[PDB]
Design a protein around this ligand. Structure first.
Ligand SMILES: *[C@@H]1O[C@H](CO)[C@@H](O[C@@H]2O[C@H](CO)[C@@H](O[C@@H]3O[C@H](CO)[C@@H](O)[C@H](O)[C@@H]3O)[C@H](O)[C@H]2NC(C)=O)[C@H](O)[C@H]1NC(C)=O
Ligand SMILES: *[C@@H]1O[C@H](CO)[C@@H](O[C@@H]2O[C@H](CO)[C@@H](O[C@@H]3O[C@H](CO)[C@@H](O)[C@H](O)[C@@H]3O)[C@H](O)[C@H]2NC(C)=O)[C@H](O)[C@H]1NC(C)=O
Ligand SMILES: *[C@@H]1O[C@H](CO)[C@@H](O[C@@H]2O[C@H](CO)[C@@H](O)[C@H](O)[C@H]2NC(C)=O)[C@H](O)[C@H]1NC(C)=O
Ligand SMILES: *[C@@H]1O[C@H](CO)[C@@H](O[C@@H]2O[C@H](CO)[C@@H](O)[C@H](O)[C@H]2NC(C)=O)[C@H](O)[C@H]1NC(C)=O
Ligand SMILES: *[C@@H]1O[C@H](CO)[C@@H](O[C@@H]2O[C@H](CO)[C@@H](O)[C@H](O)[C@H]2NC(C)=O)[C@H](O)[C@H]1NC(C)=O
Ligand SMILES: *[C@@H]1O[C@H](CO)[C@@H](O[C@@H]2O[C@H](CO)[C@@H](O)[C@H](O)[C@H]2NC(C)=O)[C@H](O)[C@H]1NC(C)=O
Ligand SMILES: *[C@@H]1O[C@H](CO)[C@@H](O[C@@H]2O[C@H](CO)[C@@H](O)[C@H](O)[C@H]2NC(C)=O)[C@H](O)[C@H]1NC(C)=O
Ligand SMILES: *[C@@H]1O[C@H](CO)[C@@H](O[C@@H]2O[C@H](CO)[C@@H](O)[C@H](O)[C@H]2NC(C)=O)[C@H](O)[C@H]1NC(C)=O
Ligand SMILES: *[C@@H]1O[C@H](CO)[C@@H](O)[C@H](O)[C@H]1NC(C)=O
Ligand SMILES: *[C@@H]1O[C@H](CO)[C@@H](O)[C@H](O)[C@H]1NC(C)=O
Ligand SMILES: *[C@@H]1O[C@H](CO)[C@@H](O)[C@H](O)[C@H]1NC(C)=O
Ligand SMILES: *[C@@H]1O[C@H](CO)[C@@H](O)[C@H](O)[C@H]1NC(C)=O
Ligand SMILES: *[C@@H]1O[C@H](CO)[C@@H](O)[C@H](O)[C@H]1NC(C)=O
Ligand SMILES: *[C@@H]1O[C@H](CO)[C@@H](O)[C@H](O)[C@H]1NC(C)=O
Ligand SMILES: *[C@@H]1O[C@H](CO)[C@@H](O)[C@H](O)[C@H]1NC(C)=O
Ligand SMILES: *[C@@H]1O[C@H](CO)[C@@H](O)[C@H](O)[C@H]1NC(C)=O
Ligand SMILES: *[C@@H]1O[C@H](CO)[C@@H](O)[C@H](O)[C@H]1NC(C)=O
Ligand SMILES: *[C@@H]1O[C@H](CO)[C@@H](O)[C@H](O)[C@H]1NC(C)=O
Ligand SMILES: *[C@@H]1O[C@H](CO)[C@@H](O)[C@H](O)[C@H]1NC(C)=O
Ligand SMILES: *[C@@H]1O[C@H](CO)[C@@H](O)[C@H](O)[C@H]1NC(C)=O
Ligand SMILES: *[C@@H]1O[C@H](CO)[C@@H](O)[C@H](O)[C@H]1NC(C)=O
Ligand SMILES: *[C@@H]1O[C@H](CO)[C@@H](O)[C@H](O)[C@H]1NC(C)=O
Ligand SMILES: *[C@@H]1O[C@H](CO)[C@@H](O)[C@H](O)[C@H]1NC(C)=O
Ligand SMILES: *[C@@H]1O[C@H](CO)[C@@H](O)[C@H](O)[C@H]1NC(C)=O
Ligand SMILES: *[C@@H]1O[C@H](CO)[C@@H](O)[C@H](O)[C@H]1NC(C)=O
Ligand SMILES: *[C@@H]1O[C@H](CO)[C@@H](O)[C@H](O)[C@H]1NC(C)=O
Lengths: 456, 118, 118, 118, 51
């Protein structure tokens, strides 16, 4: 009887929001005063006791591709890649006419010995210089083969500095005071559904910005089952993200002992070319295992045969394209590898068995990589980047944990469905790690009726 | 983050030193600090004008109108779990703020002054 | 802007979510937000040390000195319209602030402690 | 800077308008203003949850545990000069904050509500 | 040739831009303070008694 209004502060009510998230690294690095590219000067040191409150009976709803954290991360990686290579050497005087000949080992030619006139640091004299550089960095201009460099029609081209690292150190994401991040703890949770086990954090997982296509390398694993996510799986234009539960290890390398020149063009600006090769000239193979990947490809299809439950399903390779689109492209120590995956997406799966892999051969499926110096990742139309050569030998040892697929057409050929590795966006790499996070907003002020009143 | 631990319980059961550089991680940290200080001060500014300045439980002198809700006290303090109660009275809240602003403070301060001249 | 509606009445008759970009309209908005938060907190900081922390009408224990003004209470509460009264005592105001800071709070807190040991 | 004048006395004897330009002296001034406003608000936020919101001397209901210190009242109020007393109990301070947060406010607000229903 | 045009990019300072050393005071924000030594004969790296 005789209710009265009463005001409370500190009441657990949240709503949905969209805010600014900031980095948080830790102090297991940051002993040397170096500046790589993912700044980590300005990242706040994370706490050695991160708190996770386990919520009660809450049934919050999530989405895997209506997430705004992905759109922030995709713009925080492009922008942070332009702080560096802003105070660096433009290569506008290199857009000249190049003479050449070929190195004495063909198809292993993939190197070219080039000569060019340069206007030196003193603007009156003409110098003549030599450099070895790869095919896929040239365009034939029109007998003497007389060509020029790949990307002088359409872009300004910038040499990255050495002593500037590319090693993908982890990034946490924190939300400011008065906000929180919700986290899903379900074991096999698809995209876009309700949940029953939800927790709250201030600070996300250790996400590593591995720039990669066709395969997801130093990533995170599922638990007890391989899980397939898609937006609308009956439609073909939506990409398919496959997440594994046991990682498949891969061992790339580049055997060469190449050197580096130092051509000085302009005042205080040195251009680091490739010199000579000391020893033999070889390929750049990678060697994924065979009996270990057979099981993985055979238990992807046990989940694929449920969504399309009559037809036989096959795996076909990609279609033509630029070499940076249709091949597995990644970064290792400072070079950029471009291996093709036709030995992987090869087979035909009738009843979760195949005839395409014999067992009459050997293990260790090989892949032919290829090197490229001029790289225009993220498809900027007027910007490129020249990665200077690393001297010595290169090894990777990556740790494959998932992949990207897309379907082909809707034409009824047979009871046959072709999958092709073709996920055509950079955001798909970072939806694979941010699928279980959602940013909310705390509203701590509440109104309720009870039987208490003021006095005078 | 001491809140949110009773987010599923019922309503009665819950009874460093770095130079500012204008780079891409510096702008975000500065925006986060300004957001935090503003979002604290608007809640303190609302609590100040209701006479509830330094408290977490504050009774008032505004009678509860049954057009806002018709339920019973032990019906809502034993079943309803604050998210649902906030979704229920979400249409009537701003009006209630005005009744807290006038009819419990403007009539309390002036009349208090009329007692002080004795 | 609920104030200023009685700016001519006598003294007694008045009884969104955008990334911070450092462009030419972003700098102005950030400067405006910092100005607003500072200009609120200096007035709350002055009211805090006078014992008038969460009130809008606050009586004190400082007697009124006639060197400040010689007028009568009903002479100034019925004719004078706050702009003019603020222009009248503008020379004596800072001194009065000091008398509110010491002789109503420093002598009130310490003596209150002398009553609490009983 | 009205403090610090009794920094050596014993504990009982102490009873303009410029457009924001992002140049090298503008960034420092903006960082200084944000530091000042944050460092004020964290101390006011600590005082608010202890029931000591607008006071400079505030008594509580937490009994003094002798594991914190074994000394006498007139032994520490007549010899010790606040820097030394702050260096003495520096290990036990955070725990004491928690006892001010619960056992003097959480038990005071709820029980106050139990008196208001009469 | 000129002294430094193979190692550096070189920039003419403008006229009507002064070099005169006018004094600078360093101020600390609110919540901080600066201490000061008033001893007549004071070396480096020691204590004081007039602060
Ligand atoms: C870089 O600049 C030099 C500048 O000398 C270019 O050298 C040019 O080389 C050609 C080939 O030797 C010269 O051609 C000459 O033609 C006459 C007539 O047929 C023939 O009798 C000579 O034996 C000789 O072949 C040419 O005069 C010479 N100079 C110029 C100004 O063209 C060089 O080709 C340039 N390199 C590049 C990659 O642009
Ligand atoms: C699918 O990819 C596989 C690679 O995993 C391709 O299989 C490879 O086929 C060649 C030639 O058919 C095999 O070489 C042969 O091995 C036998 C037995 O050792 C030997 O008698 C032959 O002289 C020749 O050396 C090769 O071993 C095999 N790869 C592996 C790893 O076993 C296959 O061509 C691809 N395409 C299709 C449609 O299957
Ligand atoms: C690329 O071609 C140039 C052609 O000049 C080679 O440079 C010369 O190589 C010979 C053989 O060792 C040396 O005697 C000369 O001193 C080199 N310089 C010049 C200016 O003639 C260069 O070695 C070739 N590189 C490769 C990998 O074939
Ligand atoms: C992810 O799984 C959830 C199940 O937890 C799906 O949600 C159901 O979807 C069906 C068909 O669209 C509806 O009839 C149900 O009402 C949904 N809810 C429940 C609780 O069953 C969701 O559709 C799945 N998402 C995708 C993309 O497949
Ligand atoms: C990768 O696996 C291959 C086996 O297919 C290893 O063997 C050599 O690979 C090169 C590359 O084509 C061939 O030219 C050689 O003839 C192969 N030799 C033999 C004996 O098969 C290769 O050594 C492996 N590399 C690593 C680093 O494990
Ligand atoms: C993978 O796709 C390609 C086309 O992208 C298929 O190649 C065609 O194969 C048929 C069968 O003989 C030919 O008639 C066509 O001329 C081929 N090319 C094109 C462009 O259609 C290839 O068969 C597919 N792989 C599998 C295993 O079916
Ligand atoms: C991917 O690598 C494979 C390596 O086996 C290439 O497949 C063959 O390459 C040879 C090169 O001499 C061709 O003659 C064959 O026609 C190719 N196909 C087969 C079935 O043997 C394949 O071309 C490579 N793909 C790309 C895009 O480079
Ligand atoms: C500056 O003078 C002071 C004296 O007040 C020196 O301090 C003493 O130095 C001696 C010898 O190094 C030590 O044994 C003492 O412990 C120091 N302290 C005191 C309080 O006496 C100080 O070393 C001098 N510094 C320099 C650089 O000469
Ligand atoms: C959740 O639900 C269970 C059963 O309905 C109940 O016993 C429990 O108190 C609820 N709250 C929490 C925080 O577990
Ligand atoms: C680049 O320019 C050359 C001539 O300089 C031309 O032949 C070639 O087609 C151009 N490439 C593109 C993609 O425009
Ligand atoms: C929810 O997830 C947390 C994560 O550790 C786990 O401890 C808890 O047992 C889970 N609850 C249920 C009901 O599975
Ligand atoms: C998914 O794709 C199919 C095939 O185009 C379409 O008919 C359907 O409307 C889409 N959406 C849903 C929610 O199924
Ligand atoms: C590569 O060449 C350098 C040349 O100085 C030599 O010292 C080094 O041992 C070589 N490395 C290998 C693996 O042969
Ligand atoms: C394939 O489709 C037919 C109906 O056309 C159905 O009888 C059969 O069960 C389906 N196969 C499977 C494995 O479900
Ligand atoms: C697929 O497997 C079935 C047995 O389930 C077999 O009869 C058939 O020949 C196989 N191949 C095709 C193309 O259906
Ligand atoms: C691939 O897996 C199938 C199914 O277990 C097996 O029959 C076949 O021998 C495997 N291939 C190799 C090379 O082990
Ligand atoms: C190649 O196959 C063998 C199996 O005998 C395996 O031990 C090895 O790790 C494989 N190589 C790579 C690089 O995975
Ligand atoms: C509100 O409560 C009263 C009595 O408790 C009931 O008669 C009425 O149906 C309820 N609903 C509305 C919409 O008035
Ligand atoms: C609140 O307002 C909305 C919008 O006018 C209306 O549809 C709804 O019925 C109202 N009441 C509740 C209880 O949501
Ligand atoms: C303004 O002046 C008129 C007559 O000049 C007077 O009646 C009125 O009370 C004054 N104040 C206001 C607020 O209108
Ligand atoms: C102030 O008031 C007194 C009496 O009210 C009067 O005698 C005097 O003239 C007034 N003016 C001054 C300047 O004292
Ligand atoms: C206030 O101070 C000014 C400046 O000293 C002086 O001229 C004036 O007479 C004083 N008194 C008033 C009422 O303005
Ligand atoms: C603390 O005080 C008591 C009595 O005042 C004394 O006996 C004891 O030695 C003191 N020190 C410690 C460490 O307990
Ligand atoms: C405070 O803590 C430090 C560090 O554990 C310890 O060495 C010291 O004895 C403690 N007590 C005092 C009075 O400093
Ligand atoms: C520039 O020239 C001078 C003299 O010729 C020389 O001392 C200096 O090292 C040169 N700098 C470079 C980078 O070659
Ligand atoms: C300390 O320095 C101040 C500086 O003005 C001086 O006035 C004072 O006398 C000094 N004190 C001693 C004890 O020398």
């Amino acid at each position: 009887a005789k209710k009265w209004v009463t005001v409370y502060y500190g009441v657990p009510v949240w709503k949905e929001a969209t805010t600014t998230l900031f980095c948080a690294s830790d102090a297991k690095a940051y002993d040397t005063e170096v500046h790589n590219v993912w700044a980590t000067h300005a990242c706040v040191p994370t706490d050695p006791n991160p708190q996770e409150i386990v919520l009660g009976n809450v049934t919050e709803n999530f989405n895997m591709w209506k997430n705004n954290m992905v759109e922030q991360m995709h713009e925080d990686i492009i922008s942070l890649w332009d702080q560096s290579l802003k105070p660096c050497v433009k290569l506008t005087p290199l857009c000249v006419t190049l003479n050449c000949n070929n190195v004495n080992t063909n198809n292993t030619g993939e190197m070219k010995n080039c000569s060019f006139n340069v206007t030196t640091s003193i603007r009156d004299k003409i110098k003549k210089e030599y450099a070895l550089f790869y095919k896929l960095d040239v365009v034939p201009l029109e007998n003497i083969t007389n060509y020029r460099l790949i990307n002088c029609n359409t872009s300004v081209i910038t040499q990255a500095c050495p002593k500037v690292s590319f090693e993908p150190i982890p990034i946490h994401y924190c939300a400011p005071a008065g906000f929180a991040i919700l986290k899903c703890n379900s074991k096999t949770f698809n995209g876009s559904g309700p949940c029953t086990n939800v927790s709250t954090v201030q600070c996300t997982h250790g996400i590593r910005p591995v720039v990669s296509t066709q395969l997801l390398l130093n990533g995170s694993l599922a638990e007890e089952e391989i899980v397939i996510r898609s937006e609308n799986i009956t439609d073909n234009a939506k990409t398919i993200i496959v997440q594994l539960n046991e990682a498949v290890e891969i061992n790339c390398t580049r055997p060469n002992n190449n050197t580096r020149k130092s051509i000085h063009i302009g005042p205080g600006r040195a251009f680091y070319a490739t010199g000579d090769i000391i020893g033999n000239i070889r390929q750049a193979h990678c060697n994924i295992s065979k009996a270990r990947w057979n099981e993985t490809l055979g238990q992807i299809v046990a989940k694929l045969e449920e969504q399309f439950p009559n037809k036989t399903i096959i795996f076909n390779h990609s279609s033509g394209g630029d070499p940076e689109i249709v091949t597995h492209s990644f970064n290792c120590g400072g070079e950029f590898f471009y291996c093709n995956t036709t030995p992987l997406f090869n087979s035909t799966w009738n009843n979760t068995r195949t005839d395409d892999y014999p067992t009459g051969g050997e293990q260790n499926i090989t892949l032919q990589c290829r090197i490229k110096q001029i790289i225009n990742m993220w498809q900027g139309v007027g910007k490129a980047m020249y990665a200077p050569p690393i001297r010595g030998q290169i090894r990777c040892s990556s740790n494959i944990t998932g992949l990207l697929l897309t379907r082909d057409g809707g034409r009824d050929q047979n009871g046959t469905e072709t999958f092709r590795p073709g996920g055509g966006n950079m955001r798909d790499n970072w939806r694979s790690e941010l699928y279980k996070y959602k940013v909310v907003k705390i509203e701590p002020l509440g109104i309720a009726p009870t039987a208490c009143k003021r006095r005078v | 983050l001491g809140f949110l631990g009773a987010a599923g319980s019922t309503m009665g059961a819950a009874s460093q030193q770095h130079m500012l550089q204008l780079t891409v991680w510096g702008i975000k940290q500065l925006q986060a600090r300004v957001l935090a200080v503003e979002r604290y001060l608007r809640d303190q500014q609302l609590l100040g004008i209701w006479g509830c300045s330094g408290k977490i439980i504050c009774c008032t002198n505004v009678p509860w109108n049954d057009s806002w809700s018709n339920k019973t006290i032990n019906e809502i303090w034993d079943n309803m779990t604050w998210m649902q109660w906030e979704k229920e009275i979400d249409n009537y809240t701003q009006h209630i703020y005005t009744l807290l602003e006038v009819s419990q403070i403007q009539q309390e301060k002036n009349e208090q002054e009329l007692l002080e001249l004795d």
